[PDB]
Amino acid sequence: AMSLENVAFNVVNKGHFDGQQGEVPVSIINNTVYTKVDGVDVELFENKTTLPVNVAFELWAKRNIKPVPEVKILNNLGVDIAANTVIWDYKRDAPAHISTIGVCSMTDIAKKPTETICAPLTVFFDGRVDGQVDLFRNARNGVLITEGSVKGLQPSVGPKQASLNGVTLIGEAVKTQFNYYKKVDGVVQQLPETYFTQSRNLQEFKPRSQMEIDFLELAMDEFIERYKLEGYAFEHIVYGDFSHSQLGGLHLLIGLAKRFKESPFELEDFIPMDSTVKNYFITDAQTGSSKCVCSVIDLLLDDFVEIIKSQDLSVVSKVVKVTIDYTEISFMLWCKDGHVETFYPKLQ
Amino acid sequence: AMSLENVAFNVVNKGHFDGQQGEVPVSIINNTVYTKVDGVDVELFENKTTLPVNVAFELWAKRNIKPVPEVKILNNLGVDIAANTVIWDYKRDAPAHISTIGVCSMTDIAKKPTETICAPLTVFFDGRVDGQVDLFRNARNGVLITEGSVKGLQPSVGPKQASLNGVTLIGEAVKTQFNYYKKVDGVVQQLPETYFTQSRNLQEFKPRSQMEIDFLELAMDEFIERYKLEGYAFEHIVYGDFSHSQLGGLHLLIGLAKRFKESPFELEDFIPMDSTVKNYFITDAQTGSSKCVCSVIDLLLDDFVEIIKSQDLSVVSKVVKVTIDYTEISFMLWCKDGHVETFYPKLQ
Amino acid sequence: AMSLENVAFNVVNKGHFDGQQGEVPVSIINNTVYTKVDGVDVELFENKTTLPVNVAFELWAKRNIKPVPEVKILNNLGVDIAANTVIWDYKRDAPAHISTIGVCSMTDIAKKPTETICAPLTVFFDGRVDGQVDLFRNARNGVLITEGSVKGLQPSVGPKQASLNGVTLIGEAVKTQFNYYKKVDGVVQQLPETYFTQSRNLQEFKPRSQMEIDFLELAMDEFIERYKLEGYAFEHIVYGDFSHSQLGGLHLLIGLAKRFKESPFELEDFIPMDSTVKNYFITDAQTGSSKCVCSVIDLLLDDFVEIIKSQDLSVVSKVVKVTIDYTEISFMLWCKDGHVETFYPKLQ
Amino acid sequence: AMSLENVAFNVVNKGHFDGQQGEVPVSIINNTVYTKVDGVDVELFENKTTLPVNVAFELWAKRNIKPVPEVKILNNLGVDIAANTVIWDYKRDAPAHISTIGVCSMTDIAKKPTETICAPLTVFFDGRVDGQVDLFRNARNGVLITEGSVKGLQPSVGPKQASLNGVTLIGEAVKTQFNYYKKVDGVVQQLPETYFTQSRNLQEFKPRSQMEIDFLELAMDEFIERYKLEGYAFEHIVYGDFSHSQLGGLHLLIGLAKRFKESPFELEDFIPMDSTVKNYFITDAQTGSSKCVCSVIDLLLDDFVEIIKSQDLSVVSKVVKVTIDYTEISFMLWCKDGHVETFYPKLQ
Amino acid sequence: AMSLENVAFNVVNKGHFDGQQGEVPVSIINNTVYTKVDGVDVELFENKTTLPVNVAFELWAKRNIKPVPEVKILNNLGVDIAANTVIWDYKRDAPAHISTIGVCSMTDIAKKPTETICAPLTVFFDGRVDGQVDLFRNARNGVLITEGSVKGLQPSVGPKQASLNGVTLIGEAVKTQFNYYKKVDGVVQQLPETYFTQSRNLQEFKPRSQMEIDFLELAMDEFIERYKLEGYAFEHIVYGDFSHSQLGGLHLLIGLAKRFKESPFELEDFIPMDSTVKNYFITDAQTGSSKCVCSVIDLLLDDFVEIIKSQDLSVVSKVVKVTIDYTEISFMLWCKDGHVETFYPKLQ
Ligand SMILES: Cc1cn([C@H]2C[C@H](O)[C@@H](CN=[N+]=[N-])O2)c(=O)[nH]c1=O
Ligand SMILES: Cc1cn([C@H]2C[C@H](O)[C@@H](CN=[N+]=[N-])O2)c(=O)[nH]c1=O
Ligand SMILES: Cc1cn([C@H]2C[C@H](O)[C@@H](CN=[N+]=[N-])O2)c(=O)[nH]c1=O
Ligand SMILES: Cc1cn([C@H]2C[C@H](O)[C@@H](CN=[N+]=[N-])O2)c(=O)[nH]c1=O
Ligand SMILES: Cc1cn([C@H]2C[C@H](O)[C@@H](CN=[N+]=[N-])O2)c(=O)[nH]c1=O
């Protein structure tokens, strides 16, 4: 028997929804869920979604608390709905998907993914839950993660990191690297070879290779020589140009990371959602240099170097498609006299 | 196991809360409670109270659906709280009392009136409920209604009319005239002799006496003659004076009713609540005569006659005090040369 | 180029969305849509739906303004979504269907019903629109209305009445009686024989048969005589029993209508939606008789007679099933010694 | 004469309510109080309570700005209401108590604590305000703080820290250590001997003894030897076990403090209120180790050592009651072969 | 053609309003603007103003993204409205001015500043926009900024810093020091000689002279001797007195900056708006010293020293008017025996 007061009971006594018997008095006022604790109302939940307050509350309580793929990954694979769990988008404070299966009676389009309503949707399945590998086999459309081989299914090895309760991390006490599988129209699909973005914070940025350590420690000229990068415009692309009114380049998160420890800047996240390429309106506090749409990607610098050096430098301008986080990312490559002028995630 | 979804199940299937088991999907958006019926949301309750929406929804669902005293009667006797029921105030679209006893978890102060937190409050007991007559006996402060005699207690006979689901009616298939008994600090009270307002509507006003019939039928001068009312200013007080900018008199509901059938007027009910005396901002549409605060009471005309004929007409102005619906109503009485000038419920 | 301001221009100038070009200043405050007219704000739409205010505003602006089936008829036939129109549900002040097709960008699931996302949904096609008869032929699941014959398809004749801008009427200057055709999984259905509710109002109730006239005019005993209805409990079932605390019978709208003209009563419409059977919490103001869930259907009296006279009166109680408005309505039939005791739409 | 505009006046010109003459134009929109400053609206207050916006505003303005006991302390002593002041709960952004005495006409259950309505409630009295010691003597239920001896009243010495405007601190320019007194039913109650939690932040944690300094500086093995703690499971209890998927132990705030300066973690405060024991859903960023209900207490480590070493280690499992912040805190003590396995605040 | 969906389009694809063709689906719910990105609603904007949500959204999108004067400066010059741009107040999350000219059809009092409605208002003009110097010449009231000389107009050199997207900065890639001009009633006004506040953060405070570097590094006694400040009460005025319950002095932001790096304090910004003098309710965490209205100004310490030493020290108390940010700031100067007791921005 689901109820608001039982959802609330579970949150108060178990920290999330955990299937327990019980009820607690709840008051709902506008978009906030409160519970009575010793005479006074204590806030349990502020609805930040476009769902009704008591609905968002139930889905948030019912959020998956195992490590799970980052929303950008699910999105890039075309996931529409999850089987019998909620993937909570901690970057949006909302569910990652509009509807549920077997979670919540207001949002459920089905109780079980085998119901035919679910066949046109890409259902996300979790091989760590009993029975879910088999439901993927029977689903017309789906994405499946597992911790091991599935007999006959050709795997795609996922990123090292996963999200655990909004914290992105490479697991040591828990597994966060999954096999990925995808089906379109009953047909298992070959996933493409791909790079993976590293999901690091500007605040907490830590290098993950010698080349990255070198980039952070060395001066610009010295790194560019040491890694034989002359003619590839890392001065514009990665390090950034703060000399003009429009801020030049600065498209690699490590490059922002470098600049941040000298002087701060403002980054307006004006479409705040998880995604492989992010767009910020950036203002440099030291110089006043700025740029309205500054696209930024967190590639391991090794990977970025590998990507740009693979390029034919003989055309003035061309679209360069690179597979990253399973999606195809377009870059613009501008060349002159066989050297790179600029190379950036193409603004769409 | 109280829940939002179970209360909603009871509403949907039984029309009101009925102790049934079951659940239905509920969504709450601002102040409105919806349920899903075949995939579309159906509005089930709009909160018009100062309570949280889900709390108000439950108390409304749990309203007393038997004929109960009108709220004005309960306020006049000083009722603070009800025993194991909710008296719903249909004039305020809200509960009649702040707290509850054995009704709802967010608003309960106790689960039985015997608890000590209740001793100071005047608790309303309904003799029609097994065991409440005996709870009243052991209650320190309380008001009690019954349908027949209570052994060892002299009764006060109530109004003929009661409220059944917001309809004020004199019961023919059910009993609406109660016995009333009251206790302060352990001591049964003698309730004062009292008149009762008649609780009638302007639109569907019916006379309840030959004098009231004669008043609706006869012309002004005739009536005042037949009942020897020369010098009592019923022209001003009951018939109303619409010849000057400030509307004159018109303090008796029957006199509004008479006027309303010939020509309409606005009654602005600026403190919308149940009360023995109502104040209206009246605009007469035919003449433009108006009055900001026109106090109005629905007394049986004969009772109003009896009251006005029992006053000393020999002082210019004074306060005249009348027990009505068990409360003391002050009237201003204005006289000149031993005839009435005006006489109106005091605007205090 | 769809916009909030253009939809508002269309409302202001054409009364509804009409494809015109133009813009007007719009402000949105909570759930209300305003436009500026000579420097003051004029309210243009109050959202009473679970949709976002601007989304609801647009779907309402885009409502079908031709006579369309009543929502109860469409629900009974299982319509999920409409083709390139919005059926507006005037009893719920909301759209009849969750999603749209070719109507509004925030709610569209497709732009034409031929798209594959639509195949599973029962799509409502309006033969009066060029090309929709042929879209229905190629539709997997669908309901279709037409004004005249469709070649190669046997029709089901609908109710005489349709909804034009929330007014349910039998059309004299326009046609309201449609042909109905239905398809599940590619296969044209034979629609069942059915009665149709009459969709009439308590206030403005008109008879549509000599029996209905005789019922409104004659006294109870006379009528029951003229039509040989001894032993069918029309006293209880149609005329209503107001002598006990629980109101007795009163399940036929014509019987409410008769009572309403002599004395009034409260009908609490606690699930306000369009449905073939309505449940009301009724309080009779003259007697105080009442019933929490009084199920009410507006059947042509003669049709109700025909139904009750076609039952086996020889079992104490059983479920009686009747096709009405294309859906199966369960009735409880209660009998003793071969006469009817009661017979009411099942409270299920 | 109280008014919204005068409350607002005081806040603008005095920083809080200070009894001053004056008014300023105020606008209220939804839950925010604004004032006009030179043409534009400036936000004064966002209602975060379950009270009406203008009510919460007045109570917040009227908040006590002297050092006052922490809400957890008042709660543990059963305080229901304060005499002639508002204790503002800065952890809840709301008043610590539902009602007032002599503060606010919407929330006042009385003007003065001697009114009999107040007798069943534990009224908090402030010996630093004239007359309040005497009101405690006359109150049927109460908690009193003073800065010195009260003749005849046996004191309880309180914690060193108090809250001054939401900042918890041990006063140097002001006194923050009070005597505590409590009355139940007219009878002064012996307060129990008790420990006091230290109220430190994870962010700003500072040790307060050699043992705490040693814990922060030394390695685990070294401290455990230096303070002769073998067999007491500080490895699990205080230091924490991040090696498994469920995070083990970690129940002392200093232990979290230690871990925080190496690698960060997430602590969801999912019942956000002041209390002696706090429950967090914790995710370790380095390892992915997590635990849904991780109870944490800030005891001076000396005190924790004193507590655990006092225990009989010869039973597999037993509840161990310790008085802390005047309340009785239950611990679970799990032992094996005369050494501690675990010891944690019992989850209720 | 303006529209909500086109404003939203520009924000999504350009980071702000940029005049581009296009539309995106938008949902508005209460005070938040959302757009659909791949099935889910992404928040674009939370209305923090007292304007309607979709209005504030448009004005915020249309905010000036060039360096512009700080709101405190515009306010001190009496600016009421801007010509054909929005100055966004990032400290209030709202437009700096109530109305617009040529920006937004809901807020526009005119299309062009020459319309006579604009003549009584001080219109802000931006010499960097074509045609705006000339509109200032024709305006009856106005404030104009330029980057260079305007023929015949006697300039006032502004502060070195400007606001670029909420970041206050002295421009290196962009110009942030403007000429200022003002007209009252058709008459260009002499702007006064003035000091300028430095607009630094407590968090990010950086000295800007040897004297400031000395103040931060030296001990109190040493600086006061080195800069020959005996008798001027910097001990009270600048350094602050935390020894009593009322916190003494502490009126220079650099003085707060000094204290902050030793021990933290709380500063309640209780009128949160940009202004030359700021008022904080300050609580010192170390000592519990506090003060309800502590006025603070960020003058370059050199300037403050220059100001106080200019004073006649022979009167017990006098108002001392100093021009700062073009406005006249009142100080109270309290002297005794020819030495300063206190000197603070006069509380009004
Ligand atoms: C307590 C609470 C939580 N959330 C949701 C969205 C946030 O990303 C996430 C919390 N992240 N962590 N740790 O949960 C919310 O929306 N409102 C609330 O009142
Ligand atoms: C359906 C609904 C009902 N009520 C309450 C208050 C009214 O006095 C009463 C309705 N009166 N009658 N018969 O019920 C409400 O407040 N909101 C709602 O949405
Ligand atoms: C003007 C306005 C209209 N409606 C909708 C729902 C109602 O059924 C219908 C009006 N009925 N008729 N004729 O239109 C709404 O919901 N809010 C509004 O502010
Ligand atoms: C200015 C403002 C303050 N408060 C309340 C709750 C916070 O704990 C406290 C502020 N704490 N400090 N310093 O006051 C609020 O709720 N809304 C508001 O707009
Ligand atoms: C994204 C967003 C922004 N603002 C406004 C007010 C803030 O000062 C400014 C953002 N400052 N920076 N970088 O823009 C807002 O009010 N709501 C919103 O949802």
| Residue in the block written with tokens 């988008």 | A89
Same domain, yes or no, for A316 and A273?
A: yes
Q: Cα B227 to the chain's mean position, in Å?
A: 30
Q: Which tokens belong to D57?
A: 């505003």
Please name the residues in contact with C172: beta carbons below 8 A apart, sequence gap of 6 or more: none
Range of the domain at A293: 192-348
Same domain, yes or no, for D6 and D56?
A: yes
- A 10 A CB-CB count for A91 gives 18
CA atoms within 13 A on the CB side of C151: 1
Cβ-in-10-Å burial (0-12, 13-18, 19+) of B193 comes to exposed
Q: Which tokens belong to D115?
A: 């009114």
Residues of A forming the annotated binding site for uracil? 291-295, 342-346
Q: CB-based contact (8 Å) between D98 and chain B?
A: no
Residue D292: phi and psi, rounded to 5, are: -75, -45
Cβ-in-10-Å burial (0-12, 13-18, 19+) of E120 comes to exposed
C-alpha A329/C-alpha A343 separation (Å) is: 12
By three-state DSSP, how is residue E251 classified?
Answer: coil
- A120 → closest Cβ in C50, C52, C117: C117
A49 CA: nearest ligand 1 atom:
16
Asked if residue E194 lies in contact with residue E299, where contact means CB atoms within 8 angstroms, the answer is: no
Residues A121-152, buried b or exposed e (16+ Cβ, 10 A)?
bbbbbbbbeeebbebbbebbbbbbbbeeeeee
Residue numbers preceding breaks in chain C (C to N > 2.5 A): none
Q: For ligand 4, is residue D60 a contact (CB within 6 Å)?
A: yes
Residue B273: phi and psi, rounded to 5, are: -150, 170
* Of the candidates A95, A158, A94, the residue with the CA atom closest to the CA atom of residue A126: A158
End-to-end CA distance of chain A: 48
Which of E191, E214, E242 lies at the terminal end of a domain, its last residue? E191
Q: CB-based contact (8 Å) between C287 and chain B?
A: yes
Residue of C nearest to E31 (CA): C30
Cβ-in-10-Å burial (0-12, 13-18, 19+) of C83 comes to buried
Q: For ligand 1, is residue D268 a contact (CB within 6 Å)?
A: yes
D44 CA: nearest ligand 4 atom:
19
Indicate the pairing of strand A108-110 with strand A156-157. Answer: unpaired
* Of the candidates C150, C119, C122, C144, the residue with the CA atom closest to the CA atom of residue C132: C144
Mutate to test the pocket of ligand 1, among A68, A91, A93, A168 (most ligand atoms within 8 A of CB): A93
Say whether D94 and A41 touch across the interface (CB within 8 A): yes
Same domain, yes or no, for B73 and B58?
A: no
C-alpha C15/C-alpha A132 separation (Å) is: 53
Asked if residue E292 lies in contact with residue D10, where contact means CB atoms within 8 angstroms, the answer is: no
- A 10 A CB-CB count for A212 gives 18
Same domain, yes or no, for B3 and B71?
A: no
H or E element: which one contains B260?
Answer: helix B253-262
DSSP per residue, D226-253: HTT-TTS-HIIIII-B-SSSBPB---BH
* Of the candidates B145, B106, B147, the residue with the CA atom closest to the CA atom of residue B123: B145
* Of the candidates B129, B147, B131, B146, the residue with the CA atom closest to the CA atom of residue B182: B146
Residue A14 distance to chain C (closest CA, Å): 31
Residue A22 distance to chain D (closest CA, Å): 13
Asked if residue B120 lies in contact with residue D116, where contact means CB atoms within 8 angstroms, the answer is: yes
Report the domain count for chain D: 3
Is residue D95 a known part of a binding site?
A: no
Residues B308-326, buried b or exposed e (16+ Cβ, 10 A)?
beebebeeeeeebebebbb
Report resolution in angstroms. 2.1
Kindly report each contact of residues E273-276 with a partner whose C-beta sits within 8 Å and lies 24 or more positions away, as own/partner. Answer: E273/D37, E273/D40, E273/D42, E273/E71, E273/E89, E273/E91, E273/E92, E274/E70, E274/E71, E274/E72, E274/E75, E274/E89, E274/E91, E274/E92, E275/E72, E275/E75, E276/E72, E276/E76, E276/E197, E276/E324, E276/E325, E276/E327, E276/E329
Asked if residue B68 lies in contact with residue B171, where contact means CB atoms within 8 angstroms, the answer is: no
E49 CA: nearest ligand 5 atom:
16
- A 10 A CB-CB count for C35 gives 20
* Of the candidates E214, E203, E205, E347, the residue with the CA atom closest to the CA atom of residue E281: E347
Asked if residue C83 lies in contact with residue C102, where contact means CB atoms within 8 angstroms, the answer is: yes
By three-state DSSP, how is residue A124 classified?
Answer: strand
Residue A164: nearest ligand to its CA? Answer: 1
Q: Which tokens belong to B210?
A: 């030959």
Indicate the pairing of strand A123-126 with strand A142-146. Answer: parallel
By three-state DSSP, how is residue A174 classified?
Answer: coil
C-alpha E236/C-alpha E336 separation (Å) is: 14
Q: For ligand 4, is residue D48 a contact (CB within 6 Å)?
A: yes
Looking at chain D, the number of H-run helices and the number of E-run strands are: 9, 21
In this structure, what DSSP letter does residue B150 have? B
DSSP strands (E only) in E174-311 = 179-184, 187-188, 265-268, 278-284, 290-296
Cβ-in-10-Å burial (0-12, 13-18, 19+) of C314 comes to exposed
Asked if residue B82 lies in contact with residue B31, where contact means CB atoms within 8 angstroms, the answer is: no
Asked if residue B86 lies in contact with residue B103, where contact means CB atoms within 8 angstroms, the answer is: yes
Same domain, yes or no, for A318 and A246?
A: yes
Same domain, yes or no, for E41 and E86?
A: no
- A 10 A CB-CB count for C281 gives 20
- In order of A58, B236, B298, the CA distances from B303 in angstroms are 60, 18, 10
By three-state DSSP, how is residue B125 classified?
Answer: strand
Asked if residue A329 lies in contact with residue E51, where contact means CB atoms within 8 angstroms, the answer is: no
Q: Which tokens belong to E146?
A: 């330029």
Helix axes B210-217, B253-262, angle to 10 degrees: 30
* Of the candidates D135, D145, D73, D146, the residue with the CA atom closest to the CA atom of residue D110: D135
Residues E167-194, buried b or exposed e (16+ Cβ, 10 A)?
bbbbbebbebebbbbbbeeeebeebeeb
Asked if residue A254 lies in contact with residue A205, where contact means CB atoms within 8 angstroms, the answer is: yes
H or E element: which one contains A306?
Answer: helix A301-309
Which of A191, A223, A250 lies at the terminal end of a domain, its last residue? A191
Please name the residues in contact with B301: beta carbons below 8 A apart, sequence gap of 6 or more: B209, B211, B212, B215, B238, B252, B254
- A 10 A CB-CB count for A118 gives 23
Asked if residue C36 lies in contact with residue E106, where contact means CB atoms within 8 angstroms, the answer is: yes
Distance C97 CA to ligand 3 centre (A): 16
Same domain, yes or no, for A128 and A203?
A: no
Same domain, yes or no, for E231 and E342?
A: yes
Same domain, yes or no, for D291 and D335?
A: yes
Same domain, yes or no, for D289 and D244?
A: yes
Q: Which tokens belong to D46?
A: 């966002």
C-alpha B74/C-alpha B89 separation (Å) is: 11
Asked if residue A171 lies in contact with residue D287, where contact means CB atoms within 8 angstroms, the answer is: yes
Which of C138, C159, C191 lies at the terminal end of a domain, its last residue? C191
Residue B170 distance to chain C (closest CA, Å): 7
In this structure, what DSSP letter does residue D225 have? H
Indicate the pairing of strand A156-157 with strand A179-184. Answer: antiparallel
Q: Which tokens belong to D44?
A: 């004064």
Same domain, yes or no, for A198 and A338?
A: yes
C-alpha A35/C-alpha A39 separation (Å) is: 10
Helix axes A210-217, A253-262, angle to 10 degrees: 30
Same domain, yes or no, for E10 and E136?
A: no
Q: Which tokens belong to C83?
A: 């083709």
Q: Which tokens belong to E327?
A: 């406005």
Q: Which tokens belong to A113?
A: 């993914």
Q: Which tokens belong to E204?
A: 């990010």
- In order of A234, A293, A330, D141, E89, the CA distances from A342 in angstroms are 9, 15, 14, 77, 35
C-alpha B102/C-alpha B96 separation (Å) is: 16
Cβ neighbours of E111 in C, within 8 Å: none
Q: Which tokens belong to C27?
A: 């402000």
* Of the candidates B58, B15, B9, the residue with the CA atom closest to the CA atom of residue B37: B9
* Of the candidates E174, E169, E236, the residue with the CA atom closest to the CA atom of residue E201: E169
Q: CB-based contact (8 Å) between D75 and chain A?
A: yes
| Residue in the block written with tokens 């000689």 | E193
Indicate the pairing of strand A327-336 with strand A339-345. Answer: antiparallel
Q: For ligand 1, is residue A45 a contact (CB within 6 Å)?
A: yes
